[PDB]
Amino acid sequence: GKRYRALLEKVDPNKIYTIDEAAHLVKELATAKFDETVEVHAKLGIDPRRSDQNVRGTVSLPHGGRIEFRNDKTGAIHAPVGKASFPPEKLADNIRAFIRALEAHKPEGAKGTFLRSVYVTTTMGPSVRINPHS
Template identity: 35%
Template sequence: MPKHGKKYLAALAKVDRTRLYSPTEALALVKETSYTKFDGTVEAHLRLGIDPRHADQNIRTTVALPHGTGKTVRVLVFAQGEAVQAALDAGADYAGSDDLIARIDRENFFDFDVAIATPDMMGKVGRIGRKLGPRGLMPNPKSGTIVPAADLARTIREVKGGRVEIRNDKTGILHVAIGKVSFTPQQLSENFVALMDAVKAAKPSGAKGTYIRSVTLTSTMGPGVPVDPVAAQNLKA
């Protein structure tokens, strides 16, 4: 069992693990128990009543957080022709075709957080899927990262502005960053509401029983704060 330092144990002592906090109380406690010298990330962890072994029960969608995540998102766009310059003009950090694909394939270039592609590029991008896929960087229509050239500018702005992907892990748990410790309680609350609304809207038809079984909020390296899942679903911005 890993040993925790004094700062973590002091933060943990402030959390009553026998109770479920309201979202407002939990967010305040997450800010209070953050002890890192840097501006930590606030994360929401949701355990869902789904069976990830069934493809139709997996969650993969996106949500536009009204206040973003507080993180600078580096965007790479696979496109060709005039769409390359259009992507760069819209704020993409990198845009190109064969040159970028070769750089990723030969140099293991992964200095980006999100990859977007136009449909006509997917035949070529597929050749480096073995490298992009395991890193969660493969463009996919479900995550809104395969779009026509005409939609590139809008998509780039959304991604850089705070659109995040929601995707369960193999145990049926979602892990989503909803902001920074430096965010105001109102900003964190509004981002959390947006996340919960998106998760509720993405409920698979095959999911049985209680859908959102538990909710935990935490900051980077901080203790988890258990949240009342019913209150979390009923919270309004």
């Protein structure tokens, strides 16, 4: 309803935020009822039909345990990078640690945009597109 749409006015439609900007913004787009989990959604440039071009692995996040991530057949992949309660600087570390883990799974030799689109959002909040190169 209007409760959800009030958070969309805070997010800039066609602006690609930095990882540090989204870290504070994602905390503002969360309610204090149940601690909302912060997630990262990245559409990988790999073809989700190839028998050898598949991404699957784990990464020890600097602030928490390890997370399992595999390319769901839309080419996109999600992963929990902490909670809304987490400090802004610690979330940014988890975003980067996950992005760098994905970048390690980039096709052998093949050059191109491996990370097409990247978004940081909570379970009950709006999406925030970020520059993974910040």
